[PDB]
From a paper:
[name] and [name] contain disordered N- and C-terminal tails and central alpha helices that fold together into the globular [name]-[name] histone-fold domain, with very basic surfaces that bind DNA in the nucleosome. The mode of [name]-[name] recognition by [name]/IMP9 is well understood: the superhelical [name] wraps around the [name]-[name] histone-fold domain, occluding the histone’s DNA-binding surfaces and functioning as a histone chaperone. Here, biochemical and structural analyses show that [name], [name]-[name], and a [name] dimer (Nap12) associate in the absence and presence of RanGTP to form equimolar complexes.
For comparison, we also performed cryo-EM analysis with a mixture of [name], Nap12, and excess [name]-[name] without RanGTP, which produced a heterogenous mixture of particles that included unliganded Nap12, the binary [name]•[name]-[name] complex, and small populations of two different assemblies containing [name], Nap12, and [name]-[name]. Excess histone in the sample had destabilized the [name]/Nap12/[name]-[name] ternary complex (more discussion in Fig. S1).
Numbering used by the authors:
A (entry chain B): 17 to 99
B (entry chain A): 1 to 293, 302 to 895, 931 to 942, 963 to 1004
C (entry chain C): 37 to 126
D (entry chain D): 81 to 365
E (entry chain E): 83 to 365
Write the structure that this text describes.
Amino acid sequence: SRSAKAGLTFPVGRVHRLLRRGNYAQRIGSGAPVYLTAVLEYLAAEILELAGNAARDNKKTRIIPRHLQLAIRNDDELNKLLG
Amino acid sequence: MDINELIIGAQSADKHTREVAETQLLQWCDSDASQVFKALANVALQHEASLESRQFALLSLRKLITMYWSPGFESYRSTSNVEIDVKDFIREVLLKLCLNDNENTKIKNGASYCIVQISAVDFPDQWPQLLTVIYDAISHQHSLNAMSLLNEIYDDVVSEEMFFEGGIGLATMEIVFKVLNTETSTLIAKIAALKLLKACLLQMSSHNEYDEASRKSFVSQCLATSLQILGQLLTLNFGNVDVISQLKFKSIIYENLVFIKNDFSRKHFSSELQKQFKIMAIQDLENVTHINAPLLETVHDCSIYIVEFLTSVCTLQFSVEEMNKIITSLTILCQLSSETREIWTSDFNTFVSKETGLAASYNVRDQANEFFTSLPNPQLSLIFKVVSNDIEHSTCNYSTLESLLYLLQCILLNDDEITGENIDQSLQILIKTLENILVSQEIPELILARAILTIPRVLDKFIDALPDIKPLTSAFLAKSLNLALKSDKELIKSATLIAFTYYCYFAELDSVLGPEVCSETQEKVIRIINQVSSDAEEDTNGALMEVLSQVISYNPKEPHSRKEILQAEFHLVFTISSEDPANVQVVVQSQECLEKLLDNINMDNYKNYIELCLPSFINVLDSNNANNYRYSPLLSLVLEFITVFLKKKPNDGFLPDEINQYLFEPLAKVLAFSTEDETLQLATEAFSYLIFNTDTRAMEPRLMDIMKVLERLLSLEVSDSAAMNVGPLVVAIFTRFSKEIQPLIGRILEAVVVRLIKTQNISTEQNLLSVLCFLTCNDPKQTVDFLSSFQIDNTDALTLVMRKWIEAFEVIRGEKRIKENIVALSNLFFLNDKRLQKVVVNGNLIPYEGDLIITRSMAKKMPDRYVQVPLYTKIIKLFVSELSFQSLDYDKLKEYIDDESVVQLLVRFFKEVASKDVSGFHCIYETLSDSERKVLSEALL
Amino acid sequence: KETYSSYIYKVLKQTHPDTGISQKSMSILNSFVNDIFERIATEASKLAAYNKKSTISAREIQTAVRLILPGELAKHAVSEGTRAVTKYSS
Amino acid sequence: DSGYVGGLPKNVKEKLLSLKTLQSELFEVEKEFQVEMFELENKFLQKYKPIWEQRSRIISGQEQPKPEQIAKGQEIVESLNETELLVDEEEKAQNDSEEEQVKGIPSFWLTALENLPIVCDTITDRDAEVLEYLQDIGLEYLTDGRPGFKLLFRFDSSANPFFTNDILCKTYFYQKELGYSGDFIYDHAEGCEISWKDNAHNVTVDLEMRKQRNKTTKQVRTIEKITPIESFFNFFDPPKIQNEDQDEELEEDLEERLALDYSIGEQLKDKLIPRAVDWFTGAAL
Amino acid sequence: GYVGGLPKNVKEKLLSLKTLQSELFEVEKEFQVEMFELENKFLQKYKPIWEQRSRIISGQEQPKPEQIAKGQEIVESLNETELLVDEEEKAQNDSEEEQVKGIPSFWLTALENLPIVCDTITDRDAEVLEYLQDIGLEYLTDGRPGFKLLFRFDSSANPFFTNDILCKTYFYQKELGYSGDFIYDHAEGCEISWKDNAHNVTVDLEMRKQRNKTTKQVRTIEKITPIESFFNFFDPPKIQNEDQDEELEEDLEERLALDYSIGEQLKDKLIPRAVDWFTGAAL
């Protein structure tokens, strides 16, 4: 599939389908779903990295919601993006 | 011991003693928290005092735990750390309190919440035996509250490895199935077990590796046993002993069934089981509706889950009897409770918010909407026949009649086109029934509102298969408007406005009604909007703006138009939006209404429009002038409206001198004194347009003030986020006053450059590059001279400015702006200046090895690495990329060439270059990659 | 969404060799991902309309990202998108 | 030995001529024998048709095995070694709604053909793409008209995207006289023109497209090219002869292509279809 | 492999396919029976021609002018102009022509031109074959299917053995060998009643007259030692496989391959085609 070629774990096909069925535009470019998938995967990686750091500071090995909210709140850029 | 006194004081009424007790408690912890925690634990455990005293002791523990238990808490205070020996003590005490069913419910709940917090911080590294103790309690002592605690902590503590592989999952399922199979279990025990089962299903729904054979087999076995058991449970009956427990029990069963259906592969929960549970679910709808004879609330929740299941298995065929049962049950369930009727009738804004779909409440009405919206076409047509037949019989039973009309509304919202053998006769009868409902004099208010909202749906769904659709649409619309008028209920008026909005969706009213009746209905809708606008909540005002946007669209485009309608239209646009400028919907739709009200415009009409509108605005600007123009939603709103007028100039000339006389001085003051980002942004945009579109000879005396405002904005006395629109203002000043300003171009250009390089905001750099594009189109060589002679940090501004400009090209917005940038860059290219040839910019990124995602953490050691290319090469690459978005040798291509749109610009540019700039483009073409060469040559064909 | 969760697991395993994520935390992450997707897609739609262009393409996506994502998130999201597209289409 | 031949007396030469005449009579008797062979073989092809059709239905999934045939297959499995067909407990747990999601035997005929030694060499992947839609391979003996046998390949137009022909068939023809050994000798073969939906899906050719604005002829013109390529579907449209080119070029064409084509046809007809299932599973090797 | 690993639908379909294989195998058994019936029918037609040519060869029947003319036309069409008559040959008188009744060494020459069997022919065997008149073939109807070969020798004038006719038998396996044909089964043959060891071409003889040095008795010795020959075609390999013959069974299998090759050669080409191979045109 295209995601493997791009070097992405996220579902390029799912993103492309969502873009098309959302009727956001008459046409969806070939590179648009790849770019959007890369961005979403990057943001997921950021949030997961910071949540994992928060959990590891408590010496846990599990990211429960407390750690996730703590990581988002203590990171100004993510705080502004996600509240 | 003295902790008890503090508990009393903190638990007391008066502030002074409660504050004293709270402090005294805190300093003790600040000294040592060991004493306080030990004392509070002993208080909860042993005093046997008033239940309120123990409950408050537990509450204090709740508050103290987060402050002093561990740094893991955000609210942690470093004054002292709870002694380890005390930690074990309070853990033990909390377990003894929570697990013992005989304790009072308040004590158990307090202990449970404290345990939740402590476990969230301590399990499993600090508090190993938590799950051991909980499962010992559940298995041996049968502690029901232990099951509730386990349910609450399950997801926080039980990780995948323990669940699938540590045996915790199997142990939990053993507990659940032993509880459910045991015939003697009380309904409370079964409900707790079913909630714990929901927790297990959640855990099984997704896991790190689906393919693991052991995990797959475990999931299959658990799901099979669960479905068998739930099949057995639903067959039970309890002889009306406790209806609330039974309703909760059914609710949780169907929640679990929905979860299994929706979150696991279809290979589980085969179709035969789906049929069996469909029959059971229908029978349970009947049972619940009869039990209805907090009872109502629980009934409605159970109904939500049952109907959610039916929605999940709606693909199956439903027998005629099953459709009749479902329709009767939903008729009973979907009728409005007396409380909702009173709320809507007393405050129509709630009705408007719900009907427009803005209200957050989700209830059986919405779930019934979901069910009918999902049916397939054969079932949908049959159930439409059922609902229509029920409406035909229930035409004198008002209580059910609204429920039936809402069900019909839900059906008609289904995408599949209703079609059937006898539907045409049913549709004729239904149309007659709706006409009778409107004409009936004694009809209740809510039924009438539902009929009015439903009729548009009936007409839309059968836009085909209805003869004389146009007379029907005209008659129904006229009747609904006439009822909305000359009636004193805001429900009817708001419902009629929303019904009008529905009409506009499917019918071109101006064509359907004709120009005359179209104008008449515009006047009627305007009158209704005036009448209801006096009692509008925020959501109601948003809805009124939508309605008015619809009404304005139908005003005659003929050279003749009713000036009264235009005036009233603008009056409403300004009045409604002035009430609550902060409402986002009102602002956006006000801009829509104003734009389309100025869609096409000529001078004579404009002078009247500005004569009415603008004097209102100067009132607002002067009003805020006393406020020194601090931020105000109304101020921003009026600024946006002024920008809309200035943007929608009449094509037949420059702006009147009156607009200059009206707006210049107020805007001049706004830019001279305001200090907040948004206000200065909007004022700068409006002022730039005012300067740009006014006749030059009519404004030159004002040049001094213009430059004064510009110099204020350039000084950076206003922050960079402010003065965002200075670019366009400088462009306008240069365009109108090119000759008079020449001596000042150097300073203005250097200040603009200084702003451009430092800023990181995309919009600011775009606007500032607009100035460079203007100067380059006017005279490229002079722009190059200024940028090269100007110095920042001991480097010519050119290298920095060109690098910014090239990088900014990727993201500039707008057709005209893209074209402006293209022509500016084209001029730089043709100039073929050595100073430019020596400039170097950044090409593509060099990827690193592997597939690692580079986060901000890694950036320090994995920076973005570019490749360095001369400026002109990057110009050409940018243009080729643009061609690729829009849509094999140089010598042959050059020979091939010899023998207003973006693509037009780019193609003409390339042809001219290849013909003329032989050596510069030749070398670049020789270095372009083959895909680029192919796009370029294909475009050049 | 359920696919998003599995790919969240894969991304987590790449980010940390071994660490688990609760189901409710996974739902929260899926909510954030859907929110960002919606915001960027609507912004790209508006930009494509404003560019008078029928197609949402890498230009619209990049501009929407630059507009929405604060600070360094914008830079790194742009870098990731550009490098992903370069690996792709090549 | 020419000297010996000359040494034979005239009477012995007459006797040898009579013996040669007797050999010719034996040749006509062999002709009658071959005619009877062909007639009875056609009769037995009719006899085989029901079983072949039933197994084809089983392969395509149009029919489901009955318990009696299931037991007969099981007891046949107990004979020799076919325990692969013995159904295990795990499979019985499955439900028809889970198994019938795939109807028929995927790539049954493609696998059977690719397992055949001589023929599989000619099947390229591009040809194998069409073979995925192959669901039947039938035999027909040209009792009427010129003697020969015709191979039939069946497809579904609504399924395959390559051609609109539901059935593709190949024809082989023998001469009116028997061979020296008494076996049949071959005549030039013929094949059907495949009704490709479009040239792009055509598997026997390779195409190119270019546009010029040619200076040499001052023509704004578009050119298309087609080149035949090696492929199993070249098994059809066999070579034909033109006298002047036949003498020089096509002599080697008949020496090579006809031999390979005839061997492939014989291998199919004899080895493959009578043991189609064994060839599919490889027991026929 | 994986086909079995596929859900039981595929397994049951393949079981039905195997049942259809069994039904087709029964149909094919009846098919082989019909082929054997019609092969026997046409072998009944073959036999008269073979016997007539044998009569011509051994000289107890004479050609006819019409047959000679037809053979002349056939030879002219064949291009084998070596058989054409010449005026010099016509000059031969009847007395010279009748000095030999049959064709001298007809069968011997045909077998010498034969690819494989000629290798087995020795000089004494070549002398023997001059007494070979006819070669006959037959099909085995009872029990195991098979075919039988027969040779006719003029035992009256034969000074080597008294066997008027020698028959060689071949057998097939009970059921249908895979691929729709029959696989070989062991063969049996007759024993040659040689008149004496000196005239026995399957044996080389040694004559000794001795006075024993130990017992001082007077004795005359006739000694025997088998040798290879064309009649090793007879005394064929004993059994297909037996416990006591394994060491023998090695050579039995090798000679079985060789003898089945020879017999298939005979049946397919020699008995149906004898004139050309005597003349060598069939080479």
